[PDB]
Design a protein around this ligand. Structure first.
Ligand SMILES: [Zn+2]
Lengths: 170, 110, 131, 154, 194
RNA sequence: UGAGCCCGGGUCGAACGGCCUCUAGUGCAGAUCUUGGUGGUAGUAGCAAAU
RNA sequence: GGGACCGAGGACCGCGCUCUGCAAGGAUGCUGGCGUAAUGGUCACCAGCGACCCGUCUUGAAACACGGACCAAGGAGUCAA
RNA sequence: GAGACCGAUAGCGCACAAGUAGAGUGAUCGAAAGAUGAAAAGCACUUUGAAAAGAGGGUUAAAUAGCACGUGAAAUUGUUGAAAGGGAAGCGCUUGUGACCAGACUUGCGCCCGGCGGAUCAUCCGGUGUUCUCACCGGUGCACUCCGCCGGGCUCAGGCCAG
């Protein structure tokens, strides 16, 4: 580079660890109803849209049923259930657009005078609001077809007396 | 006295309603003590100077220009030593077109 | 890349000192370690429930020996010319101003250390800031 | 950081000292601890009662089993004595501190014993040895709380 | 006798040595590429040597020692000005230190690199210090600190603040600084003033 | 690892430290150790001797 | 297929393999969190488990026996031929 | 006249009232004990009271240096604060609670554009020292080159702990 190496800091050995794709579990199919276990949406019943790279999953609520927007979650932080809602009619092109990793990642007088203040909660973007609506409109129509599926996705998972998860099936 | 009024015409007609900004030194740990100094003077607000350890270091000249522009009358800087307040710097910003005025620096002992 | 040189993790086998036997009960015995020489001393015989003994197995890694938690090695400076000896070693060593260095000489050491890019462990001893 | 509890202002506190007093150290410690934290007029009347054998001071730490009586019921102790010289020397230092308060401008009816302390003096070089004592005490006024006014809305 | 000098330097005495307890020894000699005392970097025990130094005016030079000007200590060093462009100065080391030990070439390039880096750092510190306007002043001397600790106790005794506040407060009650019907005092005590 | 060593805070007032060598009256828990100082016993025994 | 502990080394070199590079002479990739406190120290105390008072001397050994109220300073293989 | 000696429990028993104090019929035996401060400037005066004592007030750079006097350890003791204590405490490993204290990466380089100033830039001129080919001054300017500086834009780089 620009600088001759000023110290004895040695370059590392060539590491032979190649990045191979993550194979998900057989249960994690698109349309599978998931149960969120951690985060601020713990105990919520969501649906899975697409399985992304390196152990993360693309997830929507839909937002008009339970209140979870288009979010990413970790696969290991999710209980997968047996109920699968049809994805027919859902725009795959919009799913591919929101699957791009930059979609979720991203001194003056004013700088000094907001120091120590809690920054105001940002109102939702108009692009994210419209992208939610273009996905859920066919999802919700498919959801309404199956009896009691809409109320099931609105409700929250909870453990009761005698519920043993090592024998319970989801 | 005629000599003192001429050298310092802003201090010596009536002063306006005061407004006080209190800050500490750079990366201060005397926030509770600086809030007690701000409670001493009415119409005083405390703003921390640095806002996290690796943030922008603001100079007292810059803060004086800032508080002058946003309608303050004086700036108080509370220097620290061994996590105890040690020096009180009083900067008179004054008003309108006259420059920022005298800077009286004291030492807090007990 | 403005930090210490890249080093292995600092691992210390023991953090507790090796207290001398019966130093808790007698005020004339200091806590500095003395090897017990009695043929029936329980510390010397290595019974359980007793004080441990220093051994070479407790010795620290050579790549991490004499190294502060920041990753720099302590270097006692006495004047400005001691600081300039760390021009080539600003990431391996840190400047420690001695307890016998006066106030104004600490000013010149602190000013030179910032220019050279070496850490100072005692940078706020006899000094204060002026606006 | 933490800040220690500051001393009461010297305009509110009167001090008095006694150094190298030829009284038993152990008798003074029990007599001073009896009158600690009291009003000055209580302490003076109590010490004149110990001289007049009417009231007794408790022996707690340096308690040689010399006197048990009904005068221990006031303290809950079974050991109570009548140190005459310890009361005489402590009266003379309370009256010194009351005089110091009067010269300073204090309210002599509201003095309390904020602090009192007995320390060992150098041993008198005569096989038999005496046990003299140093005594210090600080007399302060009772705390006066003024009424706070109602806050203004604005 | 280059080795015989080194044996005396390493194992008997050297006025430039600084022995630290941290597993390394330092050379205080100003004509050494690294601060460390070893066989490669001791300029006294190497008849052929190179060193990069920086002048007070800001110029970086390269110094050359040969076996011929060894008995003449005033003429030990050939001083060659190094270019301000970083690449031409690195090349100027390579042409001038040609057919030298590669330790000397490699450490002179490092010494050139650190000297330029410090100079850029020196200009960034001075620009920020000028903007900040803050300087480190020494704290109080222990004689002065004991002086005003002694005179503050005497001034606090002389001040008698609580009686001074009381005297001033009742003084402003008399002159009518609070006006007729004062909000500071209750009415039946204001009647006692007149 | 350790014997130990460095720094901070307070006190304090006139000299001291690192390296390499030389030197020795050179490292303490014991010796019913020596000298000094100080405890519990104990405000106890008892007011004998001494003071 | 499920779980745990571990990542020593630091340009290339060697043996190989499924050969446009690989799991082949030792962990990389991605994401997040961290300064009115991430993380430590010392003290006091609680808790589980552990754990005879040191030295000397006798003896196969324990057990006796001698010394130890406490602290500071001194204190014992030296120098000559 | 000196010292690779000792530095007030040491060095002569004696740094000072030391063969003194003191003991023994007597011959003889024989100690302990140095340091205010640069200078007494050794606390005038007011005020408790019987004292080798205080509270004010003053001297001094300093009186927590006041003829108990440089520094002022430990044993031992008082006050204040915190915690604990059902016939031992103390100690080892490992948490936890509370109190106090500390503060983690020094937290940066490289490109692009425009302006400005310098030179180690001109086959520019004069001078000085020199290892005799290298340095350092002074005056020229900005065709080229290279440094900085200011105002933008951009890049990557990083310390610890997790998933
Ligand atoms: Zn060397």
């Amino acid at each position: 580079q620009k600088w001759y190496p000023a110290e004895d800091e040695a370059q590392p050995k060539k590491v032979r660890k190649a990045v191979r794709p993550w194979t998900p579990r057989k249960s994690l199919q698109p349309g599978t109803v998931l149960i969120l276990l951690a985060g601020r949406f713990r105990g919520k019943r969501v649906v899975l849209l697409k399985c992304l790279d390196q152990g993360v999953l693309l997830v929507t609520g839909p937002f008009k049923i339970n209140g979870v927007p288009l979010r990413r979650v970790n696969a290991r932080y999710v209980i997968a259930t047996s109920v699968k809602v049809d994805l027919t009619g859902v725009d795959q092109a919009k799913i591919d657009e929101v699957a791009q990793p930059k979609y979720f990642t991203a001194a003056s007088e004013e700088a000094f005078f907001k120091q120590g203040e809690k920054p105001q909660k940002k109102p939702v973007s108009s692009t994210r609001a419209a992208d939610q609506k273009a996905i859920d409109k066919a999802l919700i129509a498919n959801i309404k077809k199956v009896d009691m599926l809409a109320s099931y996705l609105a409700s929250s998972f909870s453990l009761r007396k005698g519920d043993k998860p090592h024998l319970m099936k989801f | 006295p005629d000599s003192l009024t001429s050298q310092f015409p802003n201090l010596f007609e009536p002063p306006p309603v005061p407004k006080i900004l209190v800050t500490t030194g750079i990366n201060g740990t005397i926030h509770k003590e600086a809030e007690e100094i701000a409670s001493i003077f009415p119409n005083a607000t405390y703003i921390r100077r640095t806002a996290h350890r690796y943030a922008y270091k603001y100079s007292v000249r810059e803060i004086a220009k800032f508080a002058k522009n946003r309608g303050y009358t004086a700036l108080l800087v509370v220097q620290e030593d061994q996590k105890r307040p040690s020096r009180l710097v009083v900067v008179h910003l004054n008003g309108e077109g006259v420059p920022p005025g005298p800077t009286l620096t004291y030492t807090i002992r007990n | 890349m403005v930090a210490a040189k890249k080093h292995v993790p600092i691992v210390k086998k023991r953090t507790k000192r090796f207290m001398r036997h019966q130093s808790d009960r007698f005020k004339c015995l200091d806590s500095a370690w003395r090897k017990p020489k009695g043929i029936d001393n329980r510390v010397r015989r290595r019974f359980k429930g007793n004080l441990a003994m220093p051994s070479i197995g407790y010795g620290s890694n050579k790549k991490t020996k004499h190294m502060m938690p920041s990753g720099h090695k302590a270097f006692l400076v006495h004047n400005v010319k001691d600081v300039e000896l760390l021009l080539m070693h600003n990431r391996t060593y840190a400047a420690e101003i001695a307890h016998n260095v006066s106030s104004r000489k600490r000013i010149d050491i602190i000013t030179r250390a910032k220019q050279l890019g070496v850490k100072v462990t005692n940078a706020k001893a006899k000094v204060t800031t002026e606006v | 950081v933490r800040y220690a509890a500051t001393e009461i202002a010297p305009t509110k506190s009167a001090r008095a000292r006694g150094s190298y007093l030829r009284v038993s150290f152990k008798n003074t410690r029990e007599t001073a601890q009896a009158i600690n934290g009291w009003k000055l007029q209580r302490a003076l009347t109590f010490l004149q009662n110990v001289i007049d054998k009417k009231e007794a001071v408790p022996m707690r730490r340096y308690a040689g089993s010399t006197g048990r009586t009904a005068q221990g019921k006031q303290w809950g102790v079974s050991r109570a004595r009548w140190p005459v010289k310890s009361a005489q020397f402590l009266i003379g230092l309370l009256k010194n501190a009351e005089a110091n308060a009067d010269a300073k401008g204090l309210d002599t009816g509201n003095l309390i014993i904020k602090h009192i302390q007995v320390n060992q003096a150098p041993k008198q070089r005569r096989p038999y040895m005496s046990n003299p004592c140093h005594i210090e005490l600080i007399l302060t006024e009772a705390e006066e709380t003024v009424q706070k006014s109602e806050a203004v809305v604005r | 006798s280059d080795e015989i000098v080194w044996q005396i330097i390493n194992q008997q005495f050297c006025a430039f040595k600084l022995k630290t307890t941290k597993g390394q020894n330092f050379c205080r000699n100003e004509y050494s590429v690294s601060g460390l005392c070893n066989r490669q970097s001791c300029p006294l025990a190497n008849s052929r040597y190179a060193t990069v130094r920086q002048s007070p005016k800001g110029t970086i030079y390269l110094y050359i020692k040969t076996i011929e000007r060894s008995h003449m200590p005033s003429k030990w060093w050939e001083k060659i000005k190094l270019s301000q462009n970083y690449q031409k100065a690195l090349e100027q080391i390579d042409q001038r230190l040609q057919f030298f030990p590669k330790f000397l070439i490699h450490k002179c390039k490092q010494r050139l690199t650190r000297l330029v880096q410090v100079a850029i750092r020196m200009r960034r510190i001075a620009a920020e210090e000028a903007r900040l306007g803050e300087k480190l002043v020494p704290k109080m001397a222990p004689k002065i600190k004991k002086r005003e600790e002694a005179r503050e106790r005497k001034a606090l005794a002389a001040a008698k603040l609580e009686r001074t506040i009381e005297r001033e407060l009742l003084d402003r009650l008399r002159q009518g600084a609070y006006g007729d019907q004062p909000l500071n005092c209750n009415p039946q005590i204001w009647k006692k003033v007149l």
